[PDB]
Design a protein around this ligand. Structure first.
Ligand code: AGS
Ligand code: AGS
Ligand code: AGS
Ligand code: AGS
Ligand code: AGS
Ligand code: CL
Ligand code: CL
Ligand code: MG
Ligand code: MG
Ligand code: MG
Ligand code: MG
Ligand code: MG
Lengths: 724, 546, 196
């Protein structure tokens, strides 16, 4: 294994003519940043590119774009030889031709809009036969280098002339399309796409290798998540990137056919896949074929489910075939399919978080010229409850808007197309703001699972409590070894209790943020919403999701609402089931359960039993010092006048809760706003506003309440015996 | 490579029973037809998915050398209306042709679910077709029919009738010992690193089933291969053996696979021998003796009880303040008696749907019979008391009472109940013949408190400076659970200091003194008075309560 | 005498939304085939009975000059098993032939109700048949499918999925101002007394 041999890996630099190595390997081969390297792949093909450094890149691998990958007839994980190329000199004339299926809709000067800015100030090293991709004018066209004066390879200097005269050449049989789906078309679910890659890469990429080992590979992988999350997308991507044969089975399509045809088509699909192994059979909308057995009333329907189960069992032949399936509702699928030997591996492709949505927005703005005022991060932040498909649609909609208002001119040209103008089309931030108002988000009702953006900085006071939370949650995650030496197993869960509006919810999210661990919030009322009969499967679904997202902190907020509802046969079944789930929850799984209640007087003692929420943390009203910290936190984002004294404000609000102070800021902020409108000034919030707001300010926690809360702080653990 | 008994672990007893039923008539058929006694014909294997039901069936077929005809539920049900019935008919005819033979019906419930669970005339007809075929075994050509199902309750009860599937075998989930046995099976062919300790893996993998373990091992191998092939860069179609032998499977390869594991039978009720011994319990010495008299003696010395002419009590009731070792005692006595143990917590019973709850309670008592000698433990009863004063809590307990009465004392099934609230317990449970042995379990006295501290700190490195006898003297009124929390809170301090500054990892006196400053009592004085009162008057709650 | 936007009142905003969705792909089809961005495929009009859902569909067809193929739920579901599935096939096939075109499925819930309300094997086959056809619009043959239903909740949720009826428009009940507009439309040809 000489140093020149390296393994292909994902790319970070979107540039076509760029490949990356690690500094230690770049020094090993004796190459530097400016150097032009020659890459030799399989099938006796070659590609030339500029080399760069990458600290993240492992020395045994090389990052190259999918364009470079194709020019080499290579895939992820393959081996290629790299050797220095100082022999590259500037070109005299270059001849590139477009590929028919990517240019048949546009007319005009293809060279000025695409090739011009692509090679401008680029000095790209190219090779004869290479296919490169240029995106612009809401389209991506790929050209193939037909010839270069210094053949077979040369750099494109300003002196090099270009000729792109000619009817687009037709697609060669072996030349795979770059319009086809790949991993670079997927974002917002890195972790999941990784899991699938691990499961599938080995048996699909190295089939002979798996047959010799005798260890069992995966056969059934079930992707699930709301509609439009990219389940169908991932299946296609994995097939292309691994180079496996892809046979799609659409649930509805099969169920639209006669009894005999459905049975027949399923058979053929499997037979065809085995014929072209290695292969991936993807069953889209699986629930269409195999819903819960109780809902599958009908003879023809029952036969097809059984037909599928048998075919799945028939995969014991081990004909290098993987079966992937997608369903919106994991509970809808006949449980017979989730049994071992069939779909025995599941991957939850949930809804994207802020970071994810941003990743996605970037995917569908590749080909569009974006104005400077456009801020996708805002859009991402703003489009909560949006799913991949939602984002993909709004981008199309924001583009279509830019066309409409700019169509005034095009119409007179409709007869023909204005390619040169298509580039002049920019998409303003307004075009997104417009599309934002018109958006119909689908996954708002979905339970969100992501890392909270609430940090310790957002919480005033409670310093020692933050400390105790790091010991309970962070230490066992970051320092498992230490716990084993002392021979103690760490506690499973925590219970926040105290007066309303003191930061119980904030603490739950904060500790999750510190551990960069997933967070799931489920408020009392949410648990009382689930239909009575349905309640049983939903509580379980929650803990399942918590396991999927480990390390994860599961937070049961507003527990007092459920307490009031019991003393309710529904509220009883739920909490009793949560208790059951808690016990089944192994502490070793790194799932932390936190509960919060404003009413420790009516909380179910069962929840406080050792092994459950046995860590009783009291969270009181903020003392003088803390109140100042809270006031700063809320006023961080706001323009405050220098005259406003918060140390005094805190001194006057002894007994006020954290939420009360926030409300005071809001009321004082509302006064400043009022004055900004009536009299046209940049608003500032000054002493007079706080004084006026304070005169009407009221306290949410009475003295009587305090006395009671203080008493429970010393006697809450005693509620498991006889009541007080 | 064919399956055999040596490929099966975690169910020795069950695999033995099947051998008895099947081996004689299958190996010595001529002998049985002459004997004139009727043998078993229908054996029903049941248990969660992946427990090795299909594995066991095939193993028995190969090991006995009998002709094996497999009937897969789904495949039968994938055929046309008349066709399903016809295929069933042929299967039986083909087996009779090649007798001795074993017909294995995998996923039986796919063919014959409850009469009410069937939708369609055609489906009902297939069930009848099967029922008739089983009756046709009166031919006595002597083919034995084995069947597997995840859910015994789903099966049409008509199948459990005499002459059909009149024998059942519960292939439940494997216990710690079993899981270890299985792990050894799927690590037979792998080069195992020295740091690997399967016994830990076995202990750690609770709620894991055979198939899960087989997978956990499989995934552990792929981890060693992935990380070690990256480097080799062999790409070869055929692989060299010497490389495969040099390939070892580290304990990390298991821990990684452990975190990535989706255990399937975690929601299942476990039936195994507890690993809790008397040594884990401090004090309560006299109670431990009384438990041996009540549970062990009638098992180990049945002859003695017969001569004195008394039938031993059926069950016990632990009652007292929270966190004093009621749960520990239940598991402990089972450990001493080498008897199976089944725990059923209050909340577990209140989870069951209202209607479904009734069949589950029966199933629990059924499992208790299967595992005799067995101690059935109903824990956290106080949760159920509170829930009644609830039509659900009522139906459950009333059925538990019914089940208790149906339980014959000779079955060697001992029922124990535990509650922290003797003031709201249903008097019906305390009636002679049920849980009439009322054992009060109080806070630990000074001497007892020392024993508890000793037990909990066994696993931990404690400084020699720490005086536990003094700790015990100052913690009068603290429960067993309170003491464990002091140790844990004191250990959290020792750990905290260990992280920031790499210091000798030991917990010392100063940590305990700090833990003691914030320590609080879980049982107040008022509670004690009440518990002490009920200790003398709990038997009087069957009349008019005070 | 044919219907147009001037025959519609009481829903300015809604009729505007529909016009935007439909104008680009139906009026300037060539541009959409060349550009590569995806247009709407399924527009679902919903509201109480008699709000003018069927009216709007007809108007949009005429004003755009697109080929209009009507599919009446009840009519299709009144035919034998084979004819029902076949007629759906025919509708999509001809619409693709005469693109640009608008397929209007009136009383959608008659064909594709909630899966739970769909007692019958043959009935579900038709729903699946429809779902496939909608997916078959991947041809991107300048064809738009509009549908009307009294109860949006009654429709099989599979139809509201992306790629199918991914756009919805609420044509609610008209307000006072709206009702006035309507009254003027149907009193155009009548000589109205002064006291009116
Ligand atoms: N994670 C994603 N990253 C990038 N694009 C996405 C992602 N998810 C969805 N999209 C886009 O939205 C479209 C919908 O993706 P789909 O493959 O249809 O997901 P889906 O879950 O299979 O949809 P359903 O369940 O059939 S409605 C795709 O065509 C993508 O363009
Ligand atoms: N320590 C704090 N620091 C900053 N803001 C606080 C703090 N405590 C309370 N708040 C404010 O009160 C709001 C809600 O606080 P929570 O985290 O929900 O506390 P809580 O104990 O759950 O009380 P409730 O019943 O939810 S108001 C937040 O949005 C804050 O604006
Ligand atoms: N007791 C066991 N001993 C050894 N391996 C086991 C055992 N149980 C399960 N396995 C493994 O799990 C695999 C599948 O087990 P099965 O024989 O299919 O059990 P099963 O109960 O019939 O599964 P279902 O119910 O059809 S999903 C076997 O091939 C073994 O590799
Ligand atoms: N006598 C004891 N010896 C050792 N540990 C004890 C003792 N009593 C209680 N504990 C501790 O308390 C924990 C639980 O006690 P249990 O055995 O469950 O008694 P309990 O009456 O059921 O108390 P609760 O209500 O479950 S907290 C155990 O895990 C021990 O750590
Ligand atoms: N917004 C409107 N503007 C002008 N005329 C209307 C309007 N709405 C209803 N009408 C009249 O009332 C009749 C209503 O018929 P439709 O257009 O079929 O409404 P519809 O909601 O589709 O009826 P259903 O729901 O199928 S019973 C029309 O033919 C018009 O004459
Ligand atoms: Cl509660
Ligand atoms: Cl009770
Ligand atoms: Mg899809
Ligand atoms: Mg809160
Ligand atoms: Mg099986
Ligand atoms: Mg206990
Ligand atoms: Mg109508």
């Amino acid at each position: 294994n000489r140093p020149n041999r390296l393994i292909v890996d994902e790319a970070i630099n979107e540039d076509n003519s760029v490949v990356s190595l690690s500094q230690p390997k770049m020094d090993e081969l004796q190459l530097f940043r400016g150097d032009t390297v020659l890459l030799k792949g399989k099938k006796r093909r070659e590609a030339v590119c500029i080399v760069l450094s990458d600290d993240t890149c492992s020395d045994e691998k090389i990052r190259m774009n999918r364009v470079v990958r194709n020019n080499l007839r290579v895939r992820l994980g393959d081996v290629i030889s790299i050797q220095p190329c100082p022999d590259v000199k500037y070109g005299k004339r270059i001849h590139v031709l477009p590929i028919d299926d990517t240019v048949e809709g546009i007319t005009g000067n293809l060279f000025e809009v695409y090739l011009k800015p692509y090679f401008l100030e680029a000095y790209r090293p190219i090779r004869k036969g290479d296919i490169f991709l240029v995106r612009g004018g809401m389209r991506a066209v790929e050209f193939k280098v037909v010839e270069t004066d210094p053949s077979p390879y040369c750099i494109v200097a300003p002196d090099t002339v270009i000729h792109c005269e000619g009817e687009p050449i037709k697609r060669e049989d072996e030349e795979e399309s770059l319009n086809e789906v790949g991993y670079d078309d997927i974002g917002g679910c890195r972790k999941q796409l990784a899991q699938i890659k691990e499961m599938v890469e080995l048996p699909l990429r190295h089939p002979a290798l798996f047959k010799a080992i005798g260890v069992k590979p995966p056969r059934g992988i079930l992707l699930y998540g709301p509609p439009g999350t990219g389940k169908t997308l991932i299946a296609r991507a994995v097939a292309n990137e691994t180079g496996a044969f892809f046979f799609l089975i659409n649930g509805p399509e099969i169920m639209s056919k006669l009894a005999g045809e459905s049975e027949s088509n399923l058979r053929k699909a499997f037979e065809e896949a085995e014929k072209n192994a290695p292969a991936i059979i993807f069953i889209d909308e699986l629930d269409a074929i195999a819903p819960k057995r109780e809902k599958t009333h009908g003879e023809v329907e029952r036969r097809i489910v059984s037909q599928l189960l048998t075919l799945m069992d028939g995969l014991k032949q081990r004909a290098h075939v993987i079966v992937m399936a997608a369903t919106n509702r994991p509970n809808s699928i006949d449980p017979a399919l989730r049994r071992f030997g069939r779909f025995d591996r599941e991957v939850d492709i949930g809804i994207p978080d802020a970071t994810g949505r941003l990743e996605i927005l970037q995917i569908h703005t590749k080909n569009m010229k974006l104005a400077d005022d456009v801020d996708l991060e805002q859009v991402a932040n703003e489009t909560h409850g949006h799913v991949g498909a939602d984002l993909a649609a709004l981008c199309s909609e924001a583009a279509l808007q830019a066309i409409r208002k700019k169509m005034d001119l095009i119409d007179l040209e409709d007869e023909t197309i204005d390619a040169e103008v298509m580039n002049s089309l920019a998409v303003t931030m307004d075009d997104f703001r417009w599309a934002l108002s018109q958006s119909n988000p689908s996954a708002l009702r979905e339970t969100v699972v992501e890392v909270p953006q609430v940090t310790w900085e957002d919480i005033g006071g409670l310093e020692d409590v933050k400390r105790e939370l790091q010991e309970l949650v962070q230490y066992p995650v970051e320092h498992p070894d230490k716990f084993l030496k002392f021979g103690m197993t760490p506690s499973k869960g925590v219970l926040f209790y105290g007066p309303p509006g003191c930061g119980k919810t904030l603490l739950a999210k904060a500790i999750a943020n510190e551990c960069q661990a997933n967070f799931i919030s489920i408020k009392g009322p949410e648990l009382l919403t689930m239909w009575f009969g349905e309640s049983e499967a939903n509580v379980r679904e929650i803990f399942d999701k918590a396991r999927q997202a480990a390390p994860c902190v599961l937070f049961f907020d507003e527990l007092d609402s459920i307490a009031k509802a019991r003393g309710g046969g529904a509220a009883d079944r739920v909490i009793n089931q949560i208790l059951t789930e808690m016990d089944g929850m192994s502490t070793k799984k790194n799932v932390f359960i936190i509960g919060a209640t404003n009413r420790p007087d009516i909380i179910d003692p069962a929840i406080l039993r050792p092994g459950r929420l046995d860590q009783l943390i009291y969270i009181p009203l903020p003392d003088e010092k803390s109140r100042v910290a809270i006031l700063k936190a809320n006023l961080r984002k706001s323009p405050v006048a220098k005259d406003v004294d918060l140390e005094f404000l805190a001194k006057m609000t002894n007994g006020f809760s954290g939420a009360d102070l926030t409300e005071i800021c809001q009321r004082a902020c509302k006064l400043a706003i009022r004055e900004s409108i009536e009299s046209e000034i940049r608003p500032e919030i000054r002493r007079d506003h706080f004084e006026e707001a304070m005169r009407f300010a009221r306290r949410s926690v009475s003295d009587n309440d305090i006395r009671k809360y203080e008493m429970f702080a010393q006697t809450l653990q005693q509620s498991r015996g006889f009541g007080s």
